Amino acid sequence: SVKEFLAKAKEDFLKKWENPAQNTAHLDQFERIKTLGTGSFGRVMLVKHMETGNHYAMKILDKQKVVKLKQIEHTLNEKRILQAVNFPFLVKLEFSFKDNSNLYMVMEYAPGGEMFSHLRRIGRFSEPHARFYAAQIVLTFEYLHSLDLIYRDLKPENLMIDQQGYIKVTDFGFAKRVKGRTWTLCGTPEYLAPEIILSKGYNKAVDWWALGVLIYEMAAGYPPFFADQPIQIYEKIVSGKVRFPSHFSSDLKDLLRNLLQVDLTKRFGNLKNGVNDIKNHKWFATTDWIAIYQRKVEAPFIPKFKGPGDTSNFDDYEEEEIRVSINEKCGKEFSEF
Template sequence: MEPEYDNRHYGNGEGDMQMNGYMNAPPSGALPQHNHGHDHMDVPPPTNGAHLGYELTDFALLKTLGTGTFGRVHLTRFKNTEQFYAMKVLKKVEVVRLKQVEHINSEKQILSQIHFPFIVNMLCTFQDEKNLYMLLEYVVGGELFSHLRRAGRFSPDMTRFYAAEIVLAIEYLHNLDIIYRDLKPENLLLDERGHIKITDFGFAKKVEDRTWTLCGTPEYLAPEIIQSKGHGKAVDWWALGILIFEMLAGYPPFFDDNPFGIYEKILAGRITWPTHFDSAAKDLIKRLLTADRTKRLGNLRAGSEDIKRHKWFRGVDWDALVRKQVQAPIIPVCAHPGDTRNFETYPEPGDEEDATGGMDPFRNLFRDF
């Protein structure tokens, strides 16, 4: 009998928002004068901090795709080209009040450095008196979380496909000394062809060795984060083990009604294995969920190659996968580039008073925007 599992408990870490699926775009056009010669890419590369002179009036804000502690994400249309994007809007006064300035600037810096097939691309940023704006691809397929809940659980082949694309994305980030730290189905979007796009880099951090911040989603936290021992890249491989289990089972291996109960179960390390798990899947998950990070798969001498060579991934064509030449198991229903049927519906914001009175006391805190 499968346990009942429904709610997700969110931690209070470095992340800017706990957004439910938003971001990303069909392989359509770039913003004007923003191609940099990369014609082979689906979208233009990051702008590395350039705001390109855009203002909010250049865009039509459409439906809300996600909400968070101090902002929301809108489907938006660039008026000059009619292209659709996701616009992340963050209230400066709330970012400052919640002491998230450093983390928002870090997220912006990290997103400006990365460009990979399975990671959401940031196109530009800008600011006005009240808000910070991050323009991102719009990914029409919605959250993997929604597709998983609808299916109940995924087959081994489906799980393997998504896990393999995630392995490549984490490998890419780790090669740049970036820890992601928030791997979970809610932060995985599907593009129009069904491929993974990792979104929400609010917890991501560039670190060469170790960091000590408690952050993430309780069910996915590695023991070393809970114990404040200092943590590094190995936490992403632990989270991969949790994710593979959840995709195969329909629920994570450690859950409880409150975060502290979850932490106790993670530290105890006892897993009840569903009977339909095969031996290769169990072996991979056990190796990823090794409490001793010095023995955890992905954190050994061969790094991510150990994971890619594991018998559970046998038959995966990694080169074809990174080129998106492998057929995805789910092709999202999408009638047009601005289709939002794969996202939840949120109340739309009303007109808000300008608490700053037209002044911008925080501009110097966000110079990179």
Template sequence: MASAAMHKLLHPHRSREENHPGQQNPASSHERQDSAGMERVREEEKHNLMQWEEQKHPLAPGQIQNQEQKHVGYSSEALRQEDFELIKTLGTGTFARVWLVRVKNVNNGDENKVFALKILRKTDVIRLKQVEHVRNERNVLASVAGHPFITTMVASFQDYDSLYMLLDYCPGGEVFSYLRRARRFNEPTSQFYAAEIVLILEFLHEQQGVAYRDLKPENILIDAEGHLKLVDFGFAKKVENRETYTLCGTPEYLAPEVIRNTGHGTAVDWWAFGILVYEFLVGQPPFWDQNPMKIYEQIVEGKVRFPSAMSEDARSLISGLCTVDTSKRLGNIQGGAGTVKAHPWFRQIDWEALYYRKVGGPIVPHLRGPADTRNFDEYEPEPANREKYTKEMSDKWDEHFRDF
């Protein structure tokens, strides 16, 4: 976080007095000081990025909550895109592109300290009416930075036409890819991954009041040690005890209350978690059809059909989670996530050891090194002629992006 000294460097006092002819212009002197000060801050931040890569470790829930003491999740006024070498595109969306990057001009031995840099063009964010989602994503990621199983937003920053989120890099790629290759996960593997997700949802719901709202295998990455990292917080929203009505998510994972538009809260994540556990064990979600409307009909009906080979404990857990009545849904009833953690299907899990990453992951990716990208697809280069961010847009929208 920016120290008091750094704050002064970033926000120096400017003289408002007019200069008389013949006097030295104090503004130019201030500008030189500003520039030198900002350069010092910038170099210090780049140095700290290299240190963080060596020191990163899970923070206790109380430490994550303390924004002043943790050194991640901050908004930087010094970092710029040109501080990073763009190595390869890791993913693209309708208004964002994620790059594998390394900090430029680093010391020997630091070349393998890489990050993921999410770049969002302001024009696209505005055109696609995603301003509120992007702000939610940035602010939620800042508040949860340091959790062992959520992608760490180390810093965010912006320039005239783009927004940036600097994230830790997960070289293992998507859980979805491993699941498709394996067809289904065995019960111990499914239990391990499911347990890490329980710890994520417990923290988001009970410490942050946040509904994630897009739980699916494509949004879960595997890191170098074989642990999960939840990514893409574009639909995440701080709801606390209120209900929200935005229709968002992926058809097979939508909860009945989202489809009915009766208002929803964090309970939607426990429904999606039940669908996810089913997909881990079976290889496909329980509600499926080529026609999304048919999927919605099946979800609202809420009848899960289990294969005969599935264990009784697994059926019991999924049935408790995929309950149409939210007042009876496991995870949403009194006791919250504790009721899920206490379920017999998780009887082998040591929750504290798991949280602090003392238990090895069941699938450890084979990697050539920290910057290996073999688990990510190839993407087309960015289109050359992009819509410009105009002064009119800047005047209207820059206030909305001040959090960055």
């Protein structure tokens, strides 16, 4: 059903895109519990919806800090896109609202924690393990790209593991709906396509370059381009000569040579055959793409569970009180949120 869904999906997304849901909950409806992660101008907390008992992950963003770091349009992008999309491997936005000081996005909670945690701990994933995850990302990008959405921040830190061991892509902070090309220098250094670094203008093909980095990092335990400083990483990316671990299969290597491809006219995902150049690659020969979509494949790794509200798969973070000023801040800037 990786065809029938896409058709109905565009019509549904466009309606929500053009008429976004707004102000669908209030802060006092949630018991805040624990910080699950942190960002440039906020944090994500585990919360319990008191009325239903459900647990959620609440993203809290300081309006003033968003403005100061000129992320207003990016933040409006994030919420407008998240409220409009629907796909098995995307976190759900359940509620959103704002108060005098903050913006709130209440999302689905992924008890399995971040892929990043597991990947660093174990060192690296086997190729079948990496393939299982990578298949979900390919399907997700097929979906997003069908909607003229670019994602622009793929990395293990932004991929949650759910109770069944399947991926939930989170963190739509740099997502953008764009027909044609765009120019913002954004993303994470290790994952940036050369087009981005060279400020040439770029398109959805940067996400497929990022898929190449992700698969490399999953199977190797380290990314293809690393250094101590971003500029040194950028220098390696633009030079662009990837070298593979000796344990990489010939098939994996061929796939990565076609994803980590500087030439847009040759990069898989960006040819006339689109995503099927990837789906049909020999490395994915064993993958049942429909089974993956239907979540009927046995996950390689099911996280250690516990009664909802358990956060064993998360790092501990310094807790801070959520202050709400008696005066409204940046109201005009975030009018449509």
